[PDB]
Design a protein around this ligand. Structure first.
Ligand SMILES: Nc1ncnc2c1ncn2[C@@H]1O[C@H](COP(=O)(O)OP(=O)(O)OC[C@H]2O[C@@H](O)[C@H](O)[C@@H]2O)[C@@H](O)[C@H]1O
Ligand SMILES: Nc1ncnc2c1ncn2[C@@H]1O[C@H](COP(=O)(O)OP(=O)(O)OC[C@H]2O[C@@H](O)[C@H](O)[C@@H]2O)[C@@H](O)[C@H]1O
Ligand SMILES: [Fe+3]
Ligand SMILES: [Fe+3]
Lengths: 383, 383
């Protein structure tokens, strides 16, 4: 049998954060700890929520110590602030980095034996549900509001580790493009191709079945339809992106992804590479590697990305899908090679070993060796 | 902004009830009341769960007093057993009738002021969640396991009333075709077209939006593909129906249905007509009537029901959508006329009034008048 973890309650559309104060009152919670980052505070995005909480008369403290590719130190610091604050619930406001940090804090608080943080890696054997989380994404990106996965950086061991736990599922998700509009075009592109990567990897993942197939092929159609428009400042396309990224979440959380995420994670660990930029550069090269092990599925990807596949042979349709991704990356301004984002040639062996051991690689529909991954890094590295 | 209530946890596929004993142990629950009917006990369907519970040493009691179109009397009786059972959670085993009875019991148990049952009608103003419910459907049919609506028969007022309450959502759903196989062909046919009615009405309902559109159109595709096979005893067909009927639920719960359900409920109240048969006979007639208020959506329906809709204009396509429904009904042995199932012509005015006042009607994409519902009943009634 196949398990699906989803949000019991989610609110969708511009003004969705409007529903937060009523949801909190209904659940009888006392005091929030908002988990977020310096930018989202300074930019006024956090105030969009806190102003409504102030008006509703709902108490909150804040932790904005989160940095991109959040570290063990960031988690431990956040858990301390959560403890000193007297909060009884969590509000995650931001992208994957603040939301993953929130999940770790929420989990360790009710599962104190995991306080070293790195011991959460894998299928965390937690006995207790997280401290309730209310989740408000600010990127059109990670779907952390609906997934059971979170990614923390172990700096001592220079690796990103994936934690997978149904106990970390937020009680309510607020998916509001008014929280997303501040994203610089480059961030919309990076988080948008992260979402496309979730949906493409999820579509072809080893554990894929009919329900996740339906969710993923819909997310690919929405994301591929909307991302250029959203990067160009189109407000309706940003709302479409907000839905597409979430629908990708509903799928990949529950079945897995593949070698793109496997190879992206060590780039974050080694260089602090933005996760979506890493995914974006790797994705077409990994799709090529995986192509002959995906059955009819690249035909579907090509069709909902705007290719006429009607009279195409299967290998022709597979190339069309790969080229459609190279073209999207070009159109939204992601550079074509890993060298362009500062990946060192010397590091490929260590990166390849880290990728081989990443939790995500297990879902890849083609079984990757060390030599395959070394070669993929090289192919993606330069022309 | 649009709200989605879904199951936080759900298990899908043949053998999915195998996940029940672990879900109960992880939630620390001490004793179930199983809410079901005598037919499911008799056929050993209930034993498929209680045998697994016995092996895991999990305590249960049974209430099997549920009848089709469950009554205020049945709810009060089951409630009485729950209170004297010492149970701390519920397992609903059966179609809509047990699952809806189970939700009424679980709501009233934790919201005792609703003991008269009829005070639940509409957006039930409950302050507390239901007693936790684990939902196991045995028809390929109502999606009661994932919806927030339940339907009780008021015998003194001769009407079915809808109770809509986020507090009633089951904690875990187990969607297991093995629990469904024993449906007589006629029951697979009726519940299957109920599922199709949810998906079609959900797709064209007034509250419809992007997420519910994608769920409903996918559910129409799965059900149109699978239903003939499942009725004829095909294993895989039955598993596809089990998924499709659930996917329809994920949508219609959250946005509504229309005049088919509005007109079906009075037939249940007046004659105890099976819900699915009532929906089946009415569906193609009401689609016809709605056609001109559904923009392009009947184009999409005809397509996913296997009609080459390429050359066609909007009215060609609209009519093909309707005939695709007409044909499916015939093939699965559904009476094509209301007079076949003992609907009396004299009652049509009274039925029309009840249908105009049924909440499901409010979601209908075309705003119905009394005389329109009178005419639709007459159309659906004759040979
Ligand atoms: N609406 C916004 N407007 C402006 N800047 C924003 C906005 N939302 C986020 N940012 C900024 O974008 C930068 C990247 O934020 P992240 O949270 O790191 O981005 P995201 O891609 O959503 O999350 C990545 C993280 O999630 C994991 O899945 C992944 O492994 C990685 O750790 C930060 O400086 C953040 O302040
Ligand atoms: N697996 C099965 N095998 C054999 N018989 C079965 C099975 N499942 C159900 N039945 C029998 O089918 C009959 C109809 O069962 P219901 O639960 O009434 O059917 P369903 O269509 O699932 O629910 C209808 C109810 O749901 C509401 O949406 C609607 O208003 C109505 O009250 C009953 O006699 C029941 O015992
Ligand atoms: Fe990702
Ligand atoms: Fe129904």
């Amino acid at each position: 049998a196949n398990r699906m973890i989803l949000n019991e309650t989610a609110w969708f559309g511009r003004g969705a954060v409007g529903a937060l104060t009523d949801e909190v009152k209904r659940r009888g919670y006392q005091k929030a700890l908002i988990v977020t980052d310096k930018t989202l505070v300074q930019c006024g995005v956090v105030a969009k929520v806190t102003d409504k909480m102030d008006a509703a008369g709902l108490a909150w403290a804040i932790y904005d110590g989160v940095v991109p590719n959040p570290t063990i130190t960031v988690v431990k610091e956040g858990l301390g602030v959560f403890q000193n604050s007297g909060a009884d619930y969590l509000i995650a406001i931001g992208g994957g980095s603040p939301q993953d940090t929130c999940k770790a804090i929420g989990i360790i608080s009710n599962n104190p034996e995991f306080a070293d943080v790195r011991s959460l890696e894998g299928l965390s054997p937690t006995n207790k549900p997280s401290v309730p989380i209310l989740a408000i994404p600010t990127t059109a990106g990670t779907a952390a509001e609906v997934t059971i996965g979170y990614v923390i950086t172990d700096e001592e061991k220079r690796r990103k580790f994936v934690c997978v736990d149904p106990h970390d599922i937020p009680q309510v998700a607020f998916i509001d493009a008014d929280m997303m509009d501040g994203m610089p075009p480059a961030l919309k592109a990076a988080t948008g191709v992260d979402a496309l990567t979730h949906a493409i990897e999820g579509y072809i993942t080893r554990g894929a079945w009919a329900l996740t197939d339906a969710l993923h092929i819909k997310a690919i159609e929405i994301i591929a339809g909307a991302l250029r428009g959203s990067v160009a400042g189109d407000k309706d396309a940003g709302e479409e992106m907000a839905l597409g990224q979430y629908v990708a979440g509903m799928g990949f959380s529950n079945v897995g992804v593949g070698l793109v995420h496997g190879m992206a994670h060590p780039l974050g660990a080694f260089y602090n590479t933005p996760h979506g930029v890493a995914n974006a550069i790797l994705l077409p090269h990994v799709m090529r590697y995986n192509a002959d092990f995906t059955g009819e599925k690249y035909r579907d990807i090509a069709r909902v990305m705007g290719v006429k596949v009607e009279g195409m042979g299967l290998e022709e349709a597979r190339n069309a899908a790969v080229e459609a991704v190279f073209a999207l990356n070009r159109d939204v301004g992601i550079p074509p090679h890993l060298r362009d984002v500062g990946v060192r040639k010397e590091d490929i062996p260590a990166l390849a070993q880290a990728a081989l051991d990443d939790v995500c690689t297990g879902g890849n529909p083609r079984e990757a060796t060390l030599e395959d991954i070394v070669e993929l890094y090289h192919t993606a590295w330069t022309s």
